[PDB]
């Protein structure tokens, strides 16, 4: 909403990240929502340069929402904008733990 | 059914992360915890835990409402042995 986009251009096919799709179940219900993550960043594409990091949701694609579409709406999304993608995130995080 | 998983060793062989989901295109969000890593050869690999499941139990008790490192100090005080229930993962990606 208020979150600030990160801004990716590319020279070739590709941004450089890797887009996973997870399902959010609501309570103890079969009802789910399908949430897009950022699996993996390539190291020294334009996606790493960009700012974009690998746990990442992508809330929104050119100002677009995503929350509920599908896996490869949300591609087709990134692959329709051209050469250049505006993507709003989840606020930076760093923080995981072996167990 | 909750996945239960053994170790021998000091760690069960799988990495957790808290992660916001947003409502829609608000500033409105729940946190859940996700499986980012499963060690290949560890117990939470031989158990069936799937990098991308979330944890929604930990030995019957729910994470809902629950930060990071409380869901971690539940899987530790849990000792050897832990019955996380979780809801699936999708193989489901693309190189973008």
């Known amino acids: 909403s ?5 801004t990716i251009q ?5 941004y450089g990240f890797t887009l996973r799709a ?4 609501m309570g103890d219900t ?19 340069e960009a700012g974009l990091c690998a746990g990442d949701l992508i809330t929104h694609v050119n100002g677009e929402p995503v ?3 599908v896996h490869p709406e949300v591609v ?8 250049k993608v505006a993507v709003t995130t989840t ?9």
């Open 2 to 6: 208020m979150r600030s986009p990160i």
């Open 10 to 14: 590319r020279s070739g096919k590709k």
């Open 22 to 25: 997870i399902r959010v179940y």
């Open 30 to 48: 079969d009802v789910y929502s399908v949430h897009h993550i950022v699996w993996h960043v390539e190291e020294g594409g334009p996606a790493q």
């Open 67 to 69: 929350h509920g579409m």
């Open 76 to 83: 087709e999304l990134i692959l329709k904008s051209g050469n």
């Open 91 to 99: 606020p930076f995080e760093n923080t995981q733990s072996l167990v």
